[PDB]
């Protein structure tokens, strides 16, 4: 049904805030701090297909 197509497009073509490793507050003895990338908005037509 078109409703499920719209819902799936909304889910899969979505940007998700992935946070970051070792963010505040952090432990007292870690040296690594890097962002986490989960999902990005689709760009190409074959990506949508």
């Amino acid at each position: 049904v078109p409703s499920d197509v719209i819902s799936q497009i909304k889910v899969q073509n979505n940007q998700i805030s992935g946070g970051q490793l070792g963010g505040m507050p952090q432990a007292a003895d870690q040296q690594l701090n890097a962002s986490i990338i989960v999902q990005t908005r689709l760009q190409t037509p074959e990506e949508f297909g």
Binding site: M24, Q26, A28, D29, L32, N33
Partner: protein
Amino acid sequence: LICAGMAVLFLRTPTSFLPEEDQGVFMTTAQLPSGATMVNTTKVLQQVT
């Protein structure tokens, strides 16, 4: 000849912007390598203090 003289004076002033002065309080900034954990920044700032 007087025209040449104050034209020499005319050419004596380069295009600067503004000089400096005394204020009373100043600021110190500390920059750490990319991906540095906040613990290291805290240690550096404590060393500065």
